[PDB]
RNA sequence: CUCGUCUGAAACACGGAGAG
């Protein structure tokens, strides 16, 4: 089959930057390329057709060429909204191909988060896990440190993160960071605290609660 | 409006066989080419396989021919795929998409539909437990703990989908025990903290898990 | 009839177009 061969995986941009993202054929496909915007956790939309049509309703920054067997996506001023995952797709032949896809993200000023933390609720310390959460809320760049301590002891191996998509409109990421704990190892310590380092914090800023 | 509703999705053991539906409306699959799409979590587009119109021809990737069937009724406007020894490799997310109108998009595929998540694993589902995120010491923060579920996904809301604005759900996590847990917060207002109640409605269809949550300072 | 093409809601098969 045709191999589909896009670069690059992953760029950052600036709001007004010239973006391309191209995509080389393995063989001709001739002009039968589809470019595709896919935000996280929804469907694709169809940008470009045939290589170079715009299809209809699509902002007129968006615009693909064909040079060959070479096919270039260009967004001509990006925007918050351009945040997504783009992929080419030829239709030449069957079976249908796809490139790998580019992650395009909005670069941005730097954004301090805002952190928040939260005990374990007294219906999940009826059972025998505690889980204390910290919440960095709108901040750019993604690169964020969170660290845990109970009692001022360092934490390790007992925590996960997930951070959320960058938003579409004002560009800024949130993190959640989990501390999972024993109900008893909980009962057992009182001071609680997420230590947040971040480009937008010129020092690492604390959140903590005493249990009680 | 046009509109294709992917269903049939969930958990399938490795070497099951499931079937996923395409329900298409607001146009005919008689006068289109549709198509299957796969997503991995995290990972790329994947053509899958199309069923061609007026002929009824079938396409295939390498790597489904011989155990994937692609069909379509028309009287019921419905696409189906038919999906016989499955493996890991196979869990995705499925889209449905029409091939559009060739004087109007040439081959591109002009919609697609929502997707619908297969997971191909021996684990058992289970339901989450749902924890709140209260509200302390202008702006404050709340949310829910949806902890100790398999397979994805969950839905959440926010009173019943009337909070939008400032909520963050969390991707999901893989936790040591093989279950996930995810969180889902929002800001609000601290004024009316003593007098807007605020709920968050977790769905955990695997399961027939409903659930709603209050969360209080 | 043919097509490494175009079109009919149509990548193949079919109708039509175009060229042979
Ligand atoms: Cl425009
Ligand atoms: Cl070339
Ligand atoms: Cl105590
Ligand atoms: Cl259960």
């Known amino acids: 089959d045709i191999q589909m061969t896009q670069s690059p995986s992953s760029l950052s941009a600036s709001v007004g930057d010239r973006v391309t993202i191209t995509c080389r054929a393995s063989q001709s496909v001739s002009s039968a390329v589809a470019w595709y915007q896919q935000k996280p956790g929804k469907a694709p939309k169809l940008l470009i057709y045939?290589?170079?049509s715009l299809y209809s309703g699509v902002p007129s920054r968006f615009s693909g060429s064909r040079s060959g067997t070479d096919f270039t996506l260009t967004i001509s001023s990006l925007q918050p909204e351009d945040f997504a995952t783009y992929y080419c797709?030829?239709?030449?032949?069957?079976?249908?191909?796809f490139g790998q896809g580019t992650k395009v993200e909005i670069k941005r000023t730097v954004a301090a988060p805002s952190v928040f933390i939260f005990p374990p609720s007294d219906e999940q310390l009826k059972s025998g896990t505690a889980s204390v959460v910290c919440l960095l809320n709108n901040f750019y760049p993604r690169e964020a440190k969170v660290q845990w301590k109970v009692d001022n002891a360092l934490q390790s191996g007992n925590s996960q993160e997930s951070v959320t998509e960058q938003d579409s409109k004002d560009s800024t990421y949130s993190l959640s960071s989990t501390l999972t704990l024993s109900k008893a190892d909980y009962e057992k310590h009182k001071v609680y605290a997420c230590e947040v380092t971040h480009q937008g914090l010129s020092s690492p800023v604390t959140k903590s609660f005493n249990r009680g | 409006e046009v509109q294709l509703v992917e269903s049939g999705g969930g958990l399938v053991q490795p070497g099951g066989s499931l079937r996923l539906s395409c329900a298409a409306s607001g146009f005919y699959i008689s006068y289109s080419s549709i198509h299957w799409v796969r997503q991995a979590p995290g990972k790329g587009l994947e053509w899958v396989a199309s069923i061609s119109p007026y002929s009824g021809s079938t396409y295939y990737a390498d790597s489904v021919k011989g155990r994937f069937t692609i069909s379509a009724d028309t009287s019921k406007n419905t696409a189906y795929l038919q999906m016989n020894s499955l493996r890991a490799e196979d869990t995705a997310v499925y889209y449905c998409a029409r091939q559009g109108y060739r004087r109007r998009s040439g081959r591109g595929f002009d919609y697609w539909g929502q997707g619908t998540l297969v997971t191909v694993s021996s684990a058992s589902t289970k339901g989450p437990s749902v924890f709140p995120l209260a509200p302390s010491s202008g702006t404050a923060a709340l949310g829910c703990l949806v902890k100790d579920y398999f397979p994805e996904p969950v839905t959440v809301s926010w009173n019943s989908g009337a909070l939008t604005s400032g909520v963050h759900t969390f991707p999901a996590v893989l936790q040591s025990s093989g279950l996930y847990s995810l969180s889902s917060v929002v800001t609000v207002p601290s004024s009316s903290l003593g007098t807007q109640t605020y709920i968050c409605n977790v769905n955990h269809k695997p399961s027939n898990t409903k659930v709603d949550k209050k969360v209080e300072p």
């Open positions: 797709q030829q239709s030449y032949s069957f079976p249908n191909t």
């Open positions: 045939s290589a170079s």
